[PDB]
Amino acid sequence: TVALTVPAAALLPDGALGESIVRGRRYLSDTPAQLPDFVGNGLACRHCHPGRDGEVGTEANAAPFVGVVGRFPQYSARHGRLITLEQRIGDCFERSLNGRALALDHPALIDMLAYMSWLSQGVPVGAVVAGHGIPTLTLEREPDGVHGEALYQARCLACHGADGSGTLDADGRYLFPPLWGPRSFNTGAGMNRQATAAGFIKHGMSLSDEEAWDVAGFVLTHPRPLF
Ligand code: HEC
Ligand code: HEC
């Protein structure tokens, strides 16, 4: 692998590329408000691809976008063929954001690509960045949703709510995003898979593997939009 580094925002170039990168950041950070025609729930990309200092997709083990551009196109079992990064973004719009994919030449999509390419500056094509993806967590026992409920009350509820509906900020964006119900990710999302939810919870959200497994199980007992 190669190291995860985050470029300096002060070193952004003047001109069309720099302006596109800034728009891209905003689409990724503020997706429901910026792209209402394409987002069907309350989630922005940053809610599963977090970043510090206003950036998005810069955190190891929380599916950073640093180095993502050099890993596409790639085979998708989901599609049964090679897909592009534009198509992969469309999938997260359809599933994680319960919405609609942008056209593959939509200016907002191109701005999101520009931003991801900026984060990827200096990463060799084909290289794997340390911390890429959301590593799965699997245990060789059933997730105990009863234990998970108790863990949820103790460790998660204060932010994500008794009803998993999250907490809005003053501007109507989710400070703490919804984990289930009509404003959360749909059943087609990767986060709807036990081992992915457990891995995300483990690395972001301290919890033991056993606790992450059980609380993921509890989270995933709830209704959410059907894909
Ligand atoms: C509900 C959680 C969630 C939301 C919201 C979400 N994603 Fe994702 N995304 C994931 C998960 C899980 C993966 C799989 C990570 C992995 O490969 O291990 C993923 C993977 C990706 C990848 C591929 C990363 C790689 O390393 O191959 C891209 C690109 C991506 N998402 C873009 C977006 C964009 C753009 C948005 C906003 C439109 C978005 N996602 C919203 C959960 C989410
Ligand atoms: C300090 C408040 C806080 C606590 C406590 C917290 N979270 Fe989160 N959670 C967030 C925020 C904010 C995000 C959006 C991503 C980010 O910025 O880290 C998030 C994202 C998530 C996501 C992905 C986005 C979505 O809407 O599905 C899941 C799943 C999640 N949290 C589950 C949990 C679980 C389970 C616990 C308890 C083990 C937990 N969280 C504890 C604040 C919290």
UniProtKB/Swiss-Prot annotation:
Binds 2 heme c groups covalently per subunit. Pfam families: Cytochrome_CBB3 (PF13442), SoxA-TsdA_cyt-c (PF21342). Its EC number is 1.8.2.2. Optimum pH is 4.2. It is an enzyme of class 1 (oxidoreductase). It is found in: Periplasm. Residues 13-127, 143-223 form the Cytochrome c domain. Keywords: Heme, Iron, Metal-binding, Oxidoreductase, Periplasm, Repeat, Signal. The keyword NADP does not apply. Heme c 1 binds at C45, C48, H49. It catalyses: 2 thiosulfate + 2 Fe(III)-[cytochrome c] = tetrathionate + 2 Fe(II)-[cytochrome c] + 2 H(+). GO terms for molecular function: electron transfer activity; heme binding; metal ion binding; thiosulfate dehydrogenase activity. One of its GO terms (cellular component) is periplasmic space. Gene3D superfamilies: Cytochrome c-like domain. Heme c 2 binds at C156, C159, H160. The keyword Iron applies. Disruption phenotype: Cells are unable to produce tetrathionate from thiosulfate. Monomer. Catalyzes the oxidation of 2 molecules of thiosulfate to tetrathionate. This is Thiosulfate dehydrogenase. It comes from Allochromatium vinosum (strain ATCC 17899 / DSM 180 / NBRC 103801 / NCIMB 10441 / D). The gene is tsdA.
